[PDB]
Amino acid sequence: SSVLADALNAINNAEKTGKRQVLLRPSSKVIIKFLQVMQKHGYIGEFEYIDDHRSGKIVVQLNGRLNKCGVISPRFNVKIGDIEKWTANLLPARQFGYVILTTSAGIMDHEEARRKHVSGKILGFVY
Amino acid sequence: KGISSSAIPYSRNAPAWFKLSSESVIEQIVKYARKGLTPSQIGVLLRDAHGVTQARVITGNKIMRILKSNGLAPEIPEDLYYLIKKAVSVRKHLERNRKDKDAKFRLILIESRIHRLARYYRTVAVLPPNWKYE
RNA sequence: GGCCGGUCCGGAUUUCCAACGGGGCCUUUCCUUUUUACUUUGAAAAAAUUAGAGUGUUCAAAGCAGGCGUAUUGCUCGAAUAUAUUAGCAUGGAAUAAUAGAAUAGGUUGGUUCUAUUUCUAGGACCUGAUUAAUAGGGACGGUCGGGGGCAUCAGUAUUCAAUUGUCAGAGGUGAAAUUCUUGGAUUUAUUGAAGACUAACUACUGCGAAAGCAUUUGCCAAGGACGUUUUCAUUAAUCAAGAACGUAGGGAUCGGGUGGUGUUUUUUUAAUGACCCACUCGGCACCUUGGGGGAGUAUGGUCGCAAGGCUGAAACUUAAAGGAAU
Numbered sequence: 001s002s003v004l005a006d007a008l009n010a011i012n013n014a015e016k017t018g019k020r021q022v023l024l025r026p027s028s029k030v031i032i033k034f035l036q037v038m039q040k041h042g043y044i045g046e047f048e049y050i051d052d053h054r055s056g057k058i059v060v061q062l063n064g065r066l067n068k069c070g071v072i073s074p075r076f077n078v079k080i081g082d083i084e085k086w087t088a089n090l091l092p093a094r095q096f097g098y099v100i101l102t103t104s105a106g107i108m109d110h111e112e113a114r115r116k117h118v119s120g121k122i123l124g125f126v127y
Numbered sequence: 128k129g130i131s132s133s134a135i136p137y138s139r140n141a142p143a144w145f146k147l148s149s150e151s152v153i154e155q156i157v158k159y160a161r162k163g164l165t166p167s168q169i170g171v172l173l174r175d176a177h178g179v180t181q182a183r184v185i186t187g188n189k190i191m192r193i194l195k196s197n198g199l200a201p202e203i204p205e206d207l208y209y210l211i212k213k214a215v216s217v218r219k220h221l222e223r224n225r226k227d228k229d230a231k232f233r234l235i236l237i238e239s240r241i242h243r244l245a246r247y248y249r250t251v252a253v254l255p256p257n258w259k260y261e
Numbered sequence: 262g263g264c265c266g267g268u269c270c271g272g273a274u275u276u277c278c279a280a281c282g283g284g285g286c287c288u289u290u291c292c293u294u295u296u297u298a299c300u301u302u303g304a305a306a307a308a309a310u311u312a313g314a315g316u317g318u319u320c321a322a323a324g325c326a327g328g329c330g331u332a333u334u335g336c337u338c339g340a341a342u343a344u345a346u347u348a349g350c351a352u353g354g355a356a357u358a359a360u361a362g363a364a365u366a367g368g369u370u371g372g373u374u375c376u377a378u379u380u381c382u383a384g385g386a387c388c389u390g391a392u393u394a395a396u397a398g399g400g401a402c403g404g405u406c407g408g409g410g411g412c413a414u415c416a417g418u419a420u421u422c423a424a425u426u427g428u429c430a431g432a433g434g435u436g437a438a439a440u441u442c443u444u445g446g447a448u449u450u451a452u453u454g455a456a457g458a459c460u461a462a463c464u465a466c467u468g469c470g471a472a473a474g475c476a477u478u479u480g481c482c483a484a485g486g487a488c489g490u491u492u493u494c495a496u497u498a499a500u501c502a503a504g505a506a507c508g509u510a511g512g513g514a515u516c517g518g519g520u521g522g523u524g525u526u527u528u529u530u531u532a533a534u535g536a537c538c539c540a541c542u543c544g545g546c547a548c549c550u551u552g553g554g555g556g557a558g559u560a561u562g563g564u565c566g567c568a569a570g571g572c573u574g575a576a577a578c579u580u581a582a583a584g585g586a587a588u
Contacts, residue, residue: 017509026395030357052137054395075357077299104299104355119300120356129544130396131518133490141491167401170492180491188391191494198389206400206494213484220411220483228507229410232471233484235506244399247497 003028008069008124011035011044011060020062026055030123033107035060037100038069038126041109071124075102078122083110090125097127141184149186152179153193160199166190167205203254210241211261 007024014022024031027049035058038044044062078086083099087110091097098109103120113119155177159169170190173179183189194200201208214237221230241260249256 053139053393055393080300102357104357107356117300118355121299121358123357129487131488131490131543132396133492134396135394135491138491165401165493167493171402171490172492174490174492181493183394183493184491189493192391196389204400204494206497209400217483223482224411227411227483229470230484232506233410236471237484240399244494244497251495251497 002071002073004031004034004124005071005073007031007058008034008071011062011066012069015062015064015066018064022060022062023057024060025057027058028055030107031058034100034124037098037107037109038066041098041126043126066126069124069126072122075121075123078119080114080117080119083114083119086110086122091127097125099125135181139184141180145179145185147177152177152182152185153197156182156190156193157197157199160194165205165208166194166201204244204248207241207244207248207254210237210244214238214241 003026007027010024011022032049035044035047039047043066044060047058047060050057050059072090078101083101087094087099090099098111100107100109100123101113101120102123103113103116103118105116105118107123108116152173155173156169159172164172170182173182179185182193186193188196191200203211214234217230217234217237221227221234238260245258245260248254249258
């Protein structure tokens with residue numbers, strides 16, 4: 001499987017069973033950015049980066065804000081006219097949750113992507 | 128299948144109790160290799176006796192690199208060598224008593240495990256292609 | 262912009278400290294040796310294909326007029342907007358998935374001249390590349406562990422057979438019987454010998470093997486697991502076509518390995534290094550608690566049945582014998 005995907009499955013079902021801290025290895029930098037933006041939007045809490053020499057272990061402490069993360073396989077391009085229909089058929093409601101895209105100028109969710117007026121390929125989603 | 132592995136430490140400016148130099152280590156390594164010791168055995172001998180932690184962190188480079196750098200390198204990789212000679216020993220045993228179908232099954236598995244890293248080594252070209260089972 | 266005199270009793274001179282910005286600049290000195298997939302601009306886009314707009318066609322479907330002036334050099338609007346691509350144009354910005362990259366970087370002979378109290382000396386030529394080391398992987402090694410396998414060997418008492426005896430009417434076998442053998446002594450008893458087969462009790466919710474399967478001892482041959490490991494290599498991995506060889510969490514135990522503890526079994530100068538208890542750990546087999554809708558029926562004026570009835574003999578023959586039948 002992937003490296004972002006199983007980490008997201010871990011922090012999904014661990015808070016589904018209702019814990020406060022999770023562990024996730026191997027913690028690539030796309031995982032760093034992906035839950036960087038979700039603690040920016042207040043869906044998890046603070047998180048530590050234990051750094052061994054092998055790959056690193058991210059420890060996320062989280063409260064019961066979140067209910068579902070998730071990745072999208074594969075990661076295909078979307079337009080400014082496409083992100084609204086992807087938020088439609090990807091989130092439950094409209095102004096609630098986010099959709100995370102690898103844009104070209106950064107790594108952001110859909111509202112900051114359409115705020116900076118850029119786009120890219122779809123990465124994952126959280127609500 | 129379970130786990131049984133060494134866990135090399137977080138330190139990499141190792142190990143601060145090492146009175147010895149960094150040239151006598153290479154001297155001991157070339158001594159053991161021209162005594163005819165495989166990379167694993169020269170590593171374990173100077174780990175235990177002339178106690179290094181590992182030569183990749185005392186010297187700045189792994190022992191296969193320093194064996195090539197002192198002109199003492201193997202002609203086939205160590206894993207393929209050991210697995211080849213295990214294959215020839217089990218073939219000699221089955222040749223002796225050809226009823227051992229358990230040894231036949233194990234020989235099929237051993238030859239498949241040969242072919243795995245053999246085509247890996249052909250794709251990376253450490254030993255050159257046209258190579259199929261000596 | 263702050264801090265210090267020294268010219269005179271608050272105007273000019275000055276040192277240092279901070280904040281911006283300015284200029285020369287420190288490090289390949291020795292060596293052969295980036296494109297592609299995304300967002301913005303302008304053309305090429307024919308109606309029938311859409312919708313937008315004004316207008317009393319008597320309304321509507323239908324139809325598309327700018328009209329007024331000052332009908333004078335001017336006052337004003339409806340035919341404002343639509344995919345026309347997938348194949349296609351050209352330009353400028355930077356994450357992820359590839360991709361160039363990194364013409365990736367260094368460290369064994371003979372001859373020449375310069376040296377003072379043979380010491381001891383200085384410069385030429387010529388005689389093999391660069392991340393980490395996953396609770397991904399395979400490999401080595403150590404002590405092991407197993408009814409795992411192959412070969413050879415050893416053992417057991419049964420069973421069968423044979424021999425040597427000993428004693429006398431029964432003995433296997435059966436539900437009885439029957440049958441079988443037995444006075445040529447069987448069955449049973451004792452002493453041996455041969456033969457091949459098999460490894461009982463120990464044997465368990467224990468072990469091993471990819472599965473089927475796998476239990477006598479010893480030796481040999483190799484293999485495998487797990488554990489240990491500050492050993493090595495660096496994605497070598499995963500999954501099946503095709504083909505190949507074989508026929509939800511938690512807890513208590515227990516097996517294999519390791520670590521630590523500190524009491525008893527143990528012992529001591531021959532080498533080897535046990536058993537038990539307790540904890541932790543790793544990995545195991547386990548445990549405990551979390552080809553078509555139908556069937557039951559009831560019926561059947563269809564459809565295929567079936568028993569059908571009733572002394573035979575016995576009919577063309579009221580007919581015998583013999584047999585039921587009733588008595």
